[PDB]
Amino acid sequence: MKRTFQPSVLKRNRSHGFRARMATKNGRQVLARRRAKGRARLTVSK
Amino acid sequence: AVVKCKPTSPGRRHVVKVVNPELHKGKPFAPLLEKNSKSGGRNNNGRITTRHIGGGHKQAYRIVDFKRNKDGIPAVVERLEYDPNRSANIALVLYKDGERRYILAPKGLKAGDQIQSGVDAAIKPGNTLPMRNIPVGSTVHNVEMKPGKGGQLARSAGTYVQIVARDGAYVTLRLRSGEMRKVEADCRATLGEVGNAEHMLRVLGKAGAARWRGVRPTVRGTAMNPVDHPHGGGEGRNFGKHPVTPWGVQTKGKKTRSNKRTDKFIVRRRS
RNA sequence: GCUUGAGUCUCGUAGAGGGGGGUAGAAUUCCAGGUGUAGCGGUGAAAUGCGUAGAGAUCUGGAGGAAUACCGGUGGCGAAGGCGGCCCCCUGGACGAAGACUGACGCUCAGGUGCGAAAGCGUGGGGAGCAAACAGGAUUAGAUACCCUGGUAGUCCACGCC
RNA sequence: AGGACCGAACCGACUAAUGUCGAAAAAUUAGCGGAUGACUUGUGGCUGGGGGUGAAAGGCCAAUCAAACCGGGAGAUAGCU
RNA sequence: GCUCGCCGGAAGACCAAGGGUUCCUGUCCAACGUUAAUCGGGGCAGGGUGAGUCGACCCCUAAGGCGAGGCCGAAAGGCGUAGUCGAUGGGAAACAGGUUAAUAUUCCUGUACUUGGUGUUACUGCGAAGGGGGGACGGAGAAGGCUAUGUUGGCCGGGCGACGGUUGUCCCGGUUUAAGCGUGUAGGCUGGUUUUCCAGGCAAAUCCGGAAAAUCAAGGCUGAGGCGUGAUGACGAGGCACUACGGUGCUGAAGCAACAAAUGCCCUGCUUCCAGGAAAAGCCUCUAAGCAUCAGGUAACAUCAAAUCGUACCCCAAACCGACACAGGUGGUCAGGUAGAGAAUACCAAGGCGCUUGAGAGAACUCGGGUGAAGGAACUAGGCAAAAUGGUGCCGUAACUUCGGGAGAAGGCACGCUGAUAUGUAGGUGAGGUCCCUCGCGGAUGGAGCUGAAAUCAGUCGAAGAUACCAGCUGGCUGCAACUGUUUAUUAAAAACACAGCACUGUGCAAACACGAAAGUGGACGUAUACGGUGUGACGCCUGCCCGGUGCCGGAAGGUUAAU
RNA sequence: AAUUCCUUGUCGGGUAAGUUCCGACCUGCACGAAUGGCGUAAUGAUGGCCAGGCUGUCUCCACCCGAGACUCAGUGAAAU
RNA sequence: CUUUAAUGUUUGAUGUUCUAACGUUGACCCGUAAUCCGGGUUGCGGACAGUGUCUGGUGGGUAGUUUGACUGGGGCGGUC
RNA sequence: CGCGGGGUGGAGCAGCCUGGUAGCUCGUCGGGCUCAUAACCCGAAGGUCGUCGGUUCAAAUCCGGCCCCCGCAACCA
């Protein structure tokens, strides 16, 4: 059958990107926690 | 007229279409068109506020001159178009100054007839003039609610408003639903009924006929499950609760008239 | 060919003949209001119904639908069914007067075609009054009847069927 | 002309069989239904947790739905094992 | 390297998406591959992606998102105007061949095209976020004119043949050619040109629209293809030639005719029905605020610039998504020969594979299949499974009906090959010749060549001629739902849902209702022949009795009755 | 009867034999008129029954052809 | 004490008129090329409507919950 | 088997609850009306209160046993 992941980098960035996060307080708090945990892949990018 | 197709296929045996030879079989006037997006009954938030809205064939909005803000100028009917948005026909009317403005097409009006707007016009079907000059007991359509709004009532196929009495600054109207109403003395009305009078006999025929029109399937309340609708549940079609709307408010005979401001105008309510 | 048949033409006569479109007064019902007050209404009697939340009664005004007193007559018109307040437009038939004209084109008519009370049916409007079915009150041995209070279809309208 | 007939592409999934620690966390095979429409499909957006959407099964909402997932109250509570 | 076998509307050849060097070369074999491995999408080192014309970026805009002020909200934040983003959309311009171990419409050869900056010359009124035109559009269907493309014929070149015949109506291979420019065609749309006037186009206008005269009868626009040219050029079978034996170098014939013909193009057409079918810019055009010995606009020409990013390979799969080298899923484009209605199917071509475990044996039994004595559902929950029917043309065809159907009802007949009719007909296509002409890609006539059904008659072969693949099982009484359709993705496709239609009832527009603490939106840029809710469910004949209880509409006097 | 428990009710047709089916009889445990009643051409990957055709479904299996199974070499699991 | 009359006065209940509150999702103009919004003129309604606070009623639209035990297995009956 | 109600003149049914006095309609008998019937009018009579037993001064009644009728229940795996 057709699975649950038909990737498209445009939609991937439009709803999970950096600017996608830097738009809401909820988003800015998520990016806040990534730095708090000292993560390398803050968000999905290249 | 209202022609009926032969039963060559199941679903074609119950179709009656109104064919009008006066309809212009060409294209609409480009300078008076505007896009119009269907919404499926979604608000700003995005939820389906009103159900049964979707599908439908893409249409173009023919902006119609309701106000008739060009008084004292004669106008000639060029062609009878077809406006999908309206339930009635529209008439391409070109004034004396070389300007085309769409108007609702009255009953007795074919291609080639003349009309002028204002208090100086002749009492003839199609002319628009303030009600203080219109004879008491006349039959009009497209009555104005406000002196300059444009015409709000009786603007559908074959729907007219009968003027009952003219009392000073207020004229007692008699709407289609039977409700008597008063309106200002300077409001504009339009003689005769609205054309496309045989619209009521269109019997679509197929389920798709209503589908490409723009409506959706309405699921009955007895069919739904308990949490989905006030009715639901039961082992095989069981009812027993007083008929209510999808939100508990009891329908089938409960008045929801609550305006309080227009109580003063409404004389004799529909009975 | 002729002319007494039949038919056409010149001029008038009376008419609820037919269709569409307008309008008037009487009367009823209803709606709001004023006056005013205990019955009203009903019948053989009575009861249901309506009324002190104030009817009936009377007056002012208004919305409406249908039907057109008197004239009206074993009077008139049409093939028949059938059709009457008044008015306009379209139009048919009938008869009379004096002559002219075509010159038997006539009589009837199985099948075929059209029109055709009322009731009924169909799509969409309208609904005052009247009124099947229906409800109740009486009548009665019983009353799914006659009588009485209400009341849907229908009766009205345009277009079709029968 | 047609929600028209027959029949591939396409979408769907009625009967049977195999498979059931499979080739595969619903598929293959032999056939079936629709096939100009209420059709199918690509890309891109919108509606969200007592909310959404629903040709309505209480089905569907990232292999999870009579109330999703993750973190936090929280070492919840357990006369029970 | 030689055969066999398999896909060939794919298991072939290219883009988009998505991956991220898997592409190519040399070398290596511990680990990976379900085995071996000198092999490889594995390891190690190296090489490879070349653009003014492709795409993106860029200009424009849809859904929709964000959104200065502002409205609103306990804060957060929500909504939204001016605006600003946002392609799956519109908008400028390139084709052929050659070359690499891997890149090419990007490199080289040849030949062209588009838009701006700057400058000279000759002319000349130009000039906006404003207006007008343009862009600009639906489904379905029919026909004509063509090409891609293929078969055949002639031409050129090779061969004339390892078992009988084969110098001939003989066999094999090739017979390719673009963009641009020029002509402006089949065919499509629309009547042209001029003068005057105007409450119109929120200001103006010579532009558009409108109303009157004049004059001619054609003008303008659009437009695939063919033909010239591009091109005495490229490519080019096959030899000559040197083999590091992988291939290279050099040379080079013919290169035309007819016919068939698309789902491609003309067609963003034409006719018609209805459910009535994006926007904005580029582009063309008219002016205002103004600026005019200017600036600028138009045209020819010289010249400069056309940046940046992607470009390899996989792209119906061992490289994406399914944990895997997974019998699965994934949009678009080209898509040949014979038979055939066809992209079905069978067999083949181009091209690419033999699916990463093999070798013997020939037991029960399981899965996938074939045939089957006599019988024919006696099996069984039940004809589930298999079998059988199956094509075209023609004849023929019931009950019942809403008069469309039922119906392809059922039930039958003819099909091969050859000859003749007729050295292939009907018919289609159609050069040469002839004639005319408002002389060109013209019109009639004319008929060669090419191509080509089906039928009639006769003959002959087989047990069987729609001989294979492909390809309905039919009829009868009846329940339910009218019907096409939808639904439990992963056990339920149904009599459940929906449906057109009917009924009741709500709503007089700042509409009822709905989302939302609110604003604001949807309802509707619609307004009672309209919209919402509910019930039923085509259509036909109907739809009877009850207002006690419940709910609801109305009436308000009295009784009771909160806050104050 | 998609509704009848008692019931395989009773009668008739169908069959050698019929708890199902078709058609009627009304004693309707407990149908019934828009939570619609009664019919109906057509439609149906629908429910029930019948007749023909057709056959390995079965009577009763037999043989044959391929893929596993058995044997050999290599690699090399699992629930428990 | 009661029946009651004129005046004054005290609050309240109706009806009508008016304009200044307020509404104006009417017309027009300006900020401004901007259908939002604010202001300005004007027309129409008009001390209503609507909003806050208090209050009665309706209220499964929604939320948190209870609905016992013994029982010769549980339910029903029965009983405490 | 259990729960609840019932048994009353010839017939259909009150009264019972909250005990002492049994009522209503049709019906039966007799009379009248009419030529005769019915209908109608007048009048009287007519009931062991299913049955047995107990309690009370007193029982159709209140309680319990049995017979009969009636509605329901007669279950989940």
Which geometry of chain B do the CA atoms define? globular
Structural class of chain A: mainly alpha
Largest sheet of chain B: 6 strands, antiparallel
Amount of beta strand of chain A: under 5%
Based on the coordinates given, report the CATH architecture of chain A.
Orthogonal Bundle
Summarize the amount of helix of chain B as a percent range. under 10%
Number of helices of chain B: 1
- What's the CATH first level of the largest domain in chain B? Mainly Beta
Oligomer: part of a larger assembly
- Number of distinct beta strands of chain A: 0
Could you name the CATH topology of the largest domain in chain B?
OB fold (Dihydrolipoamide Acetyltransferase, E2P)
- Proportion of beta-strand residues of chain B: 15-25%
**Estimated radius of gyration of chain A:** 13 Å
Total beta-strand segments of chain B? 14
Query: What is the CA–CA distance across the termini of chain B?
Result: 34 Å
Largest sheet of chain A: none
SSE pattern of chain A, N- to C-terminal: HHH
CATH class of chain A: Mainly Alpha
Helix content of chain A: 40-55%
Number of domains of chain A: 1
